[PDB]
A paper describes a structure:
Using X-ray crystallography, we show that the ciliopathy-associated centriolar protein [name] contains three C2 domains. [name], for example, plays a key role in the duplication, elongation, and maturation of centrioles, which in principle could impact the production of a functional basal body (Comartin et al., 2013, Lin et al., 2013, Mahjoub et al., 2010, Wu et al., 2014). All three C2 domains of [name] (C2A, C2B, and [name]) adopt the PLC δ1-like topology II and are structurally similar to each other (root-mean-square deviation [RMSD], 2.4–2.6 Å), with major differences found mainly in their loop length. Thus, the [name] C2 domains probably play a role as protein-protein interaction modules.
While the linker between C2A and C2B is short, the linker between C2B and [name] is ∼100 residues long and enriched with proline and charged residues but largely non-conserved and without predicted secondary structure elements. Our structures revealed neither complexed Ca2+ nor potential Ca2+-coordinating top loop residues or cationic β-grooves. Prime candidates for interaction interfaces in these domains are the regions defined by strands 3 and 4 at the edges of their β sandwich that constitute their most conserved parts.
Author numbering: 447 to 612
The structure:
């Protein structure tokens, strides 16, 4: 039915929300991380699962922390969107008896990946593909007030360019 412009590339972007650490709240958080980035194709939220308890002075590795997104767009458009639209990763507290609580948000600057080294790889038909990867730890800032670092998020992202869409 519906085509895309021939100059579109097939990209694969993946986010690994690997761990959280340095909880600065005095109480235990039953943590999930949740995000939406409709540029990748859907506003449907992605979240870690199940919840994991986080207390002070520990690194907790998140389950179901990895997601890869295959999408088609123009290189120019990916550049502008990654420069202008931050990836907002929400820290939620979950409990069986209580309603879900939003504690804070990490703002991930996707364009950090664009300055990383581009490395070559080959696609499933020997075509020239490129990969960039970037890793850092970023602050989760409290949801209601401002500038209050409540947790750190260690993540990795990868961007693969499979070249022109087929």
């Amino acid at each position: 039915k519906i085509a895309v412009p021939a100059a579109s590339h097939h990209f694969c972007f993946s986010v690994d929300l690997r761990s959280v650490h340095d909880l600065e709240l005095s109480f235990p958080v039953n943590c999930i991380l949740r995000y939406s980035y409709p540029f990748f194709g859907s506003a449907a939220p992605i979240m870690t699962n199940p919840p994991v308890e986080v207390r002070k002075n520990m690194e907790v590795f998140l389950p179901q922390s990895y997601c890869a997104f295959d999408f088609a767009t123009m290189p120019h458009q990916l550049q502008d969107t990654f420069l202008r639209i931050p990836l907002l990763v929400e820290l939620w507290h979950k409990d069986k008896m209580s309603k879900d609580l939003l504690l804070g948000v990490a703002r991930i600057q996707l364009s950090n990946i664009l300055s990383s080294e581009k490395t070559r790889f080959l696609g499933a038909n020997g075509e020239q593909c490129w990969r960039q990867t970037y890793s850092e730890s970023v602050p989760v800032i409290a949801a209601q007030g401002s500038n209050n670092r409540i947790l750190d998020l260690s993540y990795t992202m990868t961007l693969e360019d499979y070249g022109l869409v087929k």
